[PDB]
Amino acid sequence: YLVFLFGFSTAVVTLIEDGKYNSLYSTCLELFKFTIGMGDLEFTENYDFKAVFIILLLAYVILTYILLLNMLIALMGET
Amino acid sequence: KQFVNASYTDSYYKGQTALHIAIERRNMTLVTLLVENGADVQAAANGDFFKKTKGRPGFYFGELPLSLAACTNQLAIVKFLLQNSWQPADISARDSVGNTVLHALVEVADNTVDNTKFVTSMYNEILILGAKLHPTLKLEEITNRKGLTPLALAASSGKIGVLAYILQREIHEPECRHLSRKFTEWAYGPVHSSLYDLSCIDTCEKNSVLEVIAYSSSETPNRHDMLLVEPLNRLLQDKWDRFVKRIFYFNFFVYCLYMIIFTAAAYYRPVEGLPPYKLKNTVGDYFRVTGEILSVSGGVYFFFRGIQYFLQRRPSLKSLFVDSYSEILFFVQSLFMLVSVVLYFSQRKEYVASMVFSLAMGWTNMLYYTRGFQQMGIYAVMIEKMILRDLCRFMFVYLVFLFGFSTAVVTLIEDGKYNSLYSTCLELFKFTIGMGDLEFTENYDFKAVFIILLLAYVILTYILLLNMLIALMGETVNKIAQESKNIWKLQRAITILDTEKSFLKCMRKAFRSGKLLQVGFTPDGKDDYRWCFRVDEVNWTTWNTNVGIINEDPG
Amino acid sequence: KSLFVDSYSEILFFVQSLFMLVSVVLYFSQRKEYVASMVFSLAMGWTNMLYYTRGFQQMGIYAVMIEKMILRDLCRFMFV
Amino acid sequence: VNKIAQESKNIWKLQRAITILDTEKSFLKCMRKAFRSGKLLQVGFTPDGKDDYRWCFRVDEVNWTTWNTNVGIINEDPG
Amino acid sequence: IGVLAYILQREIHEPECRHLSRKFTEWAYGPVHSSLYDLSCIDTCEKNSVLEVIAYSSSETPNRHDMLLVEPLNRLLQD
Numbered sequence A: 001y002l003v004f005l006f007g008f009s010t011a012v013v014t015l016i017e018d019g020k021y022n023s024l025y026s027t028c029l030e031l032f033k034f035t036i037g038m039g040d041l042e043f044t045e046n047y048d049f050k051a052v053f054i055i056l057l058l059a060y061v062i063l064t065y066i067l068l069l070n071m072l073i074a075l076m077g078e079t
Numbered sequence B: 001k002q003f004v005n006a007s008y009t010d011s012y013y014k015g016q017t018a019l020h021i022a023i024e025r026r027n028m029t030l031v032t033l034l035v036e037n038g039a040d041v042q043a044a045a046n047g048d049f050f051k052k053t054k055g056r057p058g059f060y061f062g063e064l065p066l067s068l069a070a071c072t073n074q075l076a077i078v079k080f081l082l083q084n085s086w087q088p089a090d091i092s093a094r095d096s097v098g099n100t101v102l103h104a105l106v107e108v109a110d111n112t113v114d115n116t117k118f119v120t121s122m123y124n125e126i127l128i129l130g131a132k133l134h135p136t137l138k139l140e141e142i143t144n145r146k147g148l149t150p151l152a153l154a155a156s157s158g159k160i161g162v163l164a165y166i167l168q169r170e171i172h173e174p175e176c177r178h179l180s181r182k183f184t185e186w187a188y189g190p191v192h193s194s195l196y197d198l199s200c201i202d203t204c205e206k207n208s209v210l211e212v213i214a215y216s217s218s219e220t221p222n223r224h225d226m227l228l229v230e231p232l233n234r235l236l237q238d239k240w241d242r243f244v245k246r247i248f249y250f251n252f253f254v255y256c257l258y259m260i261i262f263t264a265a266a267y268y269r270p271v272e273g274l275p276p277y278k279l280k281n282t283v284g285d286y287f288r289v290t291g292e293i294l295s296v297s298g299g300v301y302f303f304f305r306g307i308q309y310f311l312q313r314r315p316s317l318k319s320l321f322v323d324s325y326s327e328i329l330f331f332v333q334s335l336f337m338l339v340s341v342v343l344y345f346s347q348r349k350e351y352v353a354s355m356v357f358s359l360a361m362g363w364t365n366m367l368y369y370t371r372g373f374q375q376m377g378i379y380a381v382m383i384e385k386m387i388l389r390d391l392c393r394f395m396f397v398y399l400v401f402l403f404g405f406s407t408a409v410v411t412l413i414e415d416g417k418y419n420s421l422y423s424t425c426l427e428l429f430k431f432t433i434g435m436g437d438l439e440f441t442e443n444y445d446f447k448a449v450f451i452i453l454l455l456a457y458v459i460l461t462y463i464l465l466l467n468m469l470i471a472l473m474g475e476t477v478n479k480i481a482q483e484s485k486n487i488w489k490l491q492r493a494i495t496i497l498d499t500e501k502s503f504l505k506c507m508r509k510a511f512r513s514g515k516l517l518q519v520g521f522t523p524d525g526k527d528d529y530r531w532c533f534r535v536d537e538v539n540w541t542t543w544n545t546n547v548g549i550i551n552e553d554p555g
Numbered sequence C: 001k002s003l004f005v006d007s008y009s010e011i012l013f014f015v016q017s018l019f020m021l022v023s024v025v026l027y028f029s030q031r032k033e034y035v036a037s038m039v040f041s042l043a044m045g046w047t048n049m050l051y052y053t054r055g056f057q058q059m060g061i062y063a064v065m066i067e068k069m070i071l072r073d074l075c076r077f078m079f080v
Numbered sequence D: 001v002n003k004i005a006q007e008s009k010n011i012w013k014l015q016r017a018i019t020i021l022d023t024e025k026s027f028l029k030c031m032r033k034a035f036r037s038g039k040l041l042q043v044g045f046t047p048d049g050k051d052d053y054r055w056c057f058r059v060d061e062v063n064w065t066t067w068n069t070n071v072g073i074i075n076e077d078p079g
Numbered sequence E: 001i002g003v004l005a006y007i008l009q010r011e012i013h014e015p016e017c018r019h020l021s022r023k024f025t026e027w028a029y030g031p032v033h034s035s036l037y038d039l040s041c042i043d044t045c046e047k048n049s050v051l052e053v054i055a056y057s058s059s060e061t062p063n064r065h066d067m068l069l070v071e072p073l074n075r076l077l078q079d
């Protein structure tokens, strides 16, 4: 999960142009919020190519929230 | 002659002879009578009914009476044909496709207990008889039209039982024990040291067993299970622990450095407009240009390694998108990098989009190196299986439901911000991640219809489908432990073979074991060395047999 | 008794058609409630695509499992 | 989910059988090609000397144990 | 289900009474033999065929989901 979070957060922060969320820490926190049921999906607009932003966010959400956490529940059940 | 040798002329039964019919019916007396009157024992049944699979009906047995008798479990008839006083059968004869009796025996194997026992027993009997009659003949070294020996044919066809029998073959009969592939070097009390012949296992220059199994197509019946046969697992572990672990660790370190440099270079991209960007005179600018050069170099390297793979392995366009997922992923990342460079030098801003896609793919590609550690590798295999089955079914059904309910809701809405399909789709998707509003708009009539639609969608997706996905994931996880372990082992075998084929710089130390005498001498007085692999075993029951030991003064 | 314990797809398709026809009737009576009936019909029609999962083994068994979940677990949970 | 694998498979098979029967009963436009198998002699003749055809369905089987019984075979020159 | 399975695969090897059987052996070459299944009154009888009776049976029939597993029926439906 940490590998995936760092990769997608670096991609998103690279896409962002300027503003409050042009820092690695801020974007990392914004993306971690998705894990605890508080993700925004529209936390910033300082970019071009809104499609790239939404595609990145959706891919991260599908890979982590919908797959990894439920798989963790299943593996815990096995153990 | 011309009466006891008459044969069918129809293309379906072309080549059939009365000897074949007598052999099939399991009649020894009739076979002897026919052979006495000059029946030819080299008659070939070339009819279409005797082909392997072309046409649904048929039974392939090698087309020769000896092969027919062997494949039908008639030991007495086989022996009679081999050592008759009228016309002895040729043990080294090949059929149209070049398959001998052993090739046909491998072909008729189907991985069942009774069939496996029959085939292995008949193989052993034929080998012993051939050694007795012609001690100078190498039956197992004869290749067919495809250029495969019986061992290679068994390995490439998924005949796990025959492969297991061959690799651990032990013959304790003097004057014929040179045919064995497993030997006992010494035995002291309960512990004995065994030697496994590795000829044609890890290096044959045509097709070794390891290469054949590792690079087999996705349709091979038992590709993931064939590496569990005794010697192969230990051999692969030995190669790993001797050089491949260290080469793999170095590769992982280099990839980590490359990704760190790429991330740093992309983080500090200038924001001025319309690249290319002029080089300022500062240390930071020089570092940022160096990083961008290194990233492009890595992208080019991965692009060329993908091209080289696609050329060397030649995927059949079905193994392309059902096997080799990592090759495709790395190639696509390199493609994004190169497209980004091209856009950058055309004065386009879309190079940033391509670059961020490349960066995300590169960071997710680190999961490839989990292979090399058992627990993480099996975890990654399980992740792959989850994605391939459970997430794919769930996503299909969920997308259908989401689109249907979003179209209904947007149709109900009258005007405003949410009168677009994209906006309503996003609003309804927010419910999946725990952020649904339930009151995000009021631009409608019939509030009851709006709330009913939202509640129905919530119940159908959030409360049912996601929890059902968790349950199905639990079932799948429960059912795939051994399969995932075997797949991880095959992945590591492929890594080991690739490293061996393309060693780090120049050191070809990848040699199996010691060069030893294991049976002393062939039927001729000359002595033989075989390149054996040593395995130590401890046994307490059956305290002492110590037959056939090669060497005194153990140790 | 087989009407409401068997034949679920027949009833679902029939109810969707009923919503469509009621929508038409309301439309020609100068009523705005035709929109409500139409959106109900649209949602039912999109969810009815799950019928065609039969014809593929894995998706068909997945749909059967969904039906069983709805019939037992969701019904007890929803009551309580 | 753990307890209903076989039941779900059987229910899916019954659903597909119902679909097949419905399609047969009401074919697409006019082509009634929905005939089972070939028209063959299987026992030769009834107790009376007359011969009988039955509309049989062919299934091929491979068996290795009990190598050869070959009793009651209808037809020579197999294939 | 037991009676149905017995009837559909009935094989009588006694001469002068084997015309009563519903399963036959067309030919046998070595380990592979071809079997013929009588399909009379199975997929079309104009009164009530076995397939129609099972498919359109009421929900109270004891083994409606399991009766299609009897040997010939599954292969016939797949064909």
Ligand SMILES: CCCCCCCC/C=C\CCCCCCCC(=O)OC[C@H](COP(=O)(O)OCC[N+](C)(C)C)OC(=O)CCCCCCC/C=C\CCCCCCCC
Binding pocket: A058, A062, B321, B322, B325, B328, B329, B332, B335, B336, B339, B387, B388, B389, B391, B392, B395
């Ligand atoms: C400049 C460069 C241009 C390139 C642009 C492309 C960039 C995108 C990045 C990568 C794309 C390439 C990588 C994909 C390779 C092919 C994968 C595939 O296609 O493999 C199909 C599988 C085949 O193997 P199999 O069937 O036997 O699997 C079971 C396996 N067994 C039974 C053997 C165990 O078949 C299946 O079923 C799986 C079918 C789908 C698999 C993918 C994931 C499905 C799961 C969830 C989808 C989530 C996103 C959906 C979209 C949502 C948006 C709102």
Ligand SMILES: CCCCCCCC/C=C\CCCCCCCC(=O)OC[C@H](COP(=O)(O)OCC[N+](C)(C)C)OC(=O)CCCCCCC/C=C\CCCCCCCC
Binding pocket: B455, B459, C004, C005, C008, C011, C012, C015, C018, C019, C022, C070, C071, C072, C074, C075, C078
């Ligand atoms: C203009 C047109 C006008 C028409 C307007 C109507 C539109 C609405 C759309 C469709 C309605 C028709 C479709 C319903 C057909 C009857 C379904 C039913 O009724 O089947 C009752 C079942 C009987 O089969 P069974 O008992 O043997 O099931 C176990 C099965 N076995 C044991 C055999 C395996 O009996 C049960 O137990 C299940 C009892 C309830 C089943 C439904 C779902 C229950 C689960 C969750 C409810 C979630 C919503 C609750 C409301 C929340 C609002 C806040």
